[PDB]
């Protein structure tokens, strides 16, 4: 049995630059050492998508030993809007537990509080 949520480690903020490519990394651990990689995503609040203003945000997940490795990458178009956005690494263990639920992401967005796996995406 597994009732404990996986834990994301992600940089608190990632800064990207118009016209330029970027690459950052997050990792995930879980008590069971077993994951649901296809249900581990990088997304904005509203839907399982990179989000408005950040449609160029990409990711790829692999399992390395007992961890997931989440590569967060892309190329920022030269005419993207400059600003700061909250995004979420949402990981699922093999048993279906998630680090942050849809409910929690919504409360965090409105209340300006934090969940595990959240990060600031800063465009300059
Ligand atoms: Ca677990």
Author numbering: 398 to 521
What are the paper's exact sentences on this?
Many streptococci adhere to protein-attached carbohydrates expressed on cell surfaces using Siglec-like binding regions (SLBRs). Siglec-like binding regions (SLBRs) are among the streptococcal adhesive modules that bind sialoglycans. SLBRs contain two adjacent modules: a Siglec domain, which shares some features with mammalian Siglecs, and a Unique domain13 with no close homologs outside of the family. The conserved sialic acid-recognition motif governs general specificity while sequence diversity in surrounding loop regions allows the SLBR to select between related sialoglycans.
Only the crystallization conditions for SLBRHsa and the isolated Siglec domain of SLBRGspB (SLBRGspB-Siglec) supported sialoglycan binding. Distinct loops in SLBRHsa and SLBRGspB showed the largest conformational differences between the unbound and sialoglycan-bound structures. In the sTa-bound structure of SLBRGspB-Siglec, the helix of the FG loop is rotated 10° as compared to the unliganded conformation. This rotation results in a maximum physical displacement of 1.3 Å, which optimizes contacts to the GalNAc of sTa. Moreover, temperature factor analysis suggests that these loops have high flexibility in the absence of ligand.
